[PDB]
Amino acid sequence: NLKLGFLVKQPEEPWFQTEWKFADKAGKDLGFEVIKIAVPDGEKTLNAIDSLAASGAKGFVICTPDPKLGSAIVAKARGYDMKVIAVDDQFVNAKGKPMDTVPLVMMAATKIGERQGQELYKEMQKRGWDVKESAVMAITANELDTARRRTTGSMDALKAAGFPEKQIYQVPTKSNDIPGAFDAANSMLVQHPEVKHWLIVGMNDSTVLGGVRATEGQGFKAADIIGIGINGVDAVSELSKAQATGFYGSLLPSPDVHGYKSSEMLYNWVAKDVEPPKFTEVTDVVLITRDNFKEELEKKGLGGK
Ligand SMILES: OC[C@H]1O[C@H](O)[C@H](O)[C@@H](O)[C@H]1O
Numbered sequence: 541n542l543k544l545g546f547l548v549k550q551p552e553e554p555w556f557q558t559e560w561k562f563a564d565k566a567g568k569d570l571g572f573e574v575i576k577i578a579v580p581d582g583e584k585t586l587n588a589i590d591s592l593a594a595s596g597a598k599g600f601v602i603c604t605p606d607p608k609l610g611s612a613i614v615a616k617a618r619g620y621d622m623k624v625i626a627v628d629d630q631f632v633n634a635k636g637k638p639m640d641t642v643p644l645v646m647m648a649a650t651k652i653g654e655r656q657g658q659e660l661y662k663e664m665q666k667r668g669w670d671v672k673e674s675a676v677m678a679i680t681a682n683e684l685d686t687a688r689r690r691t692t693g694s695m696d697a698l699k700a701a702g703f704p705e706k707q708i709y710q711v712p713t714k715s716n717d718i719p720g721a722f723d724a725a726n727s728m729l730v731q732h733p734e735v736k737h738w739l740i741v742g743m744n745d746s747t748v749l750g751g752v753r754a755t756e757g758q759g760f761k762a763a764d765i766i767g768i769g770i771n772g773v774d775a776v777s778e779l780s781k782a783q784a785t786g787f788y789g790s791l792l793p794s795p796d797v798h799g800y801k802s803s804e805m806l807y808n809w810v811a812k813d814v815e816p817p818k819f820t821e822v823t824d825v826v827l828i829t830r831d832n833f834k835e836e837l838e839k840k841g842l843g844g845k
Pocket residue numbers: 553555603628629646647686716743744770771
């Protein structure tokens with residue numbers, strides 16, 4: 541019967557593959573089929589929408605590849621009598637202000653970013669690094685609000701625990717992926733020869749991993765590096781390696797909730813004109829490291845590791 545879209549900007553990340561698996565579980569429970577389309581750039585996004593109107597879909601969940609496409613995605617969907625829910629990244633108007641009217645499902649970004657900052661400082665104390673030869677590398681993507689609130693929340697926590705403000709160095713990355721973050725961290729590294737230990741701050745696992753691979757290339761051994769990712773499911777290949785590395789752990793939020801919950805809310809609204817709440821913030825988070833990753837994921841239902 542009913543066909544609903546689930547469009548994601550980055551199908552390569554296990555984060556979005558998980559949302560897709562859980563949207564499928566909601567289609568089997570509620571009686572709808574989920575059409576799964578990758579939308580890595582804005583042209584594919586707008587095309588994908590035409591494509592869903594041709595398959596007869598009545599609505600879609602989307603994680604847009606650029607928040608500034610919001611108006612266009614809304615104009616096209618209104619065009620085809622399709623309801624829209626945004627997952628993870630909020631639509632913004634042309635001036636950059638949030639479009640408050642499309643229902644949104646996202647993580648509590650500031651709170652998880654603060655947890656990241658508090659865990660970096662606890663591991664730094666466990667290792668006993670001297671703060672005078674340590675520094676924070678913060679890889680930022682400030683044009684995306686969800687990314688910006690996670691890195692600022694993390695820098696803010698670090699400064700609140702007492703890490704010196706002037707030894708916090710920010711560098712923007714051009715893409716939210718390993719090659720982008722690598723290039724960014726590499727450029728920051730050669731500018732600071734005085735630093736003997738680094739904390740790496742990034743909004744997600746791929747961003748922290750690019751950071752860590754750059755440090756390795758510049759001769760830091762793992763004891764001198766601490767990076768902690770966000771997404772959990774994306775760091776399982778790192779945490780499964782024989783050897784420990786500078787990537788110490790990752791904060792596991794709930795992509796299963798993002799996937800099923802937005803897909804069930806879209807269906808209630810398409811099928812019973814039941815209006816979704818405008819804003820749903822998911823606060824779940826657990827620290828996974830090489831010691832508990834397998835247990836914690838099996839415990840959240842994401843079995844295998
Ligand atoms: O909501 C969490 C989600 O936030 C953004 O969309 C990131 O690019 C993803 O990798 C994921 O971390």
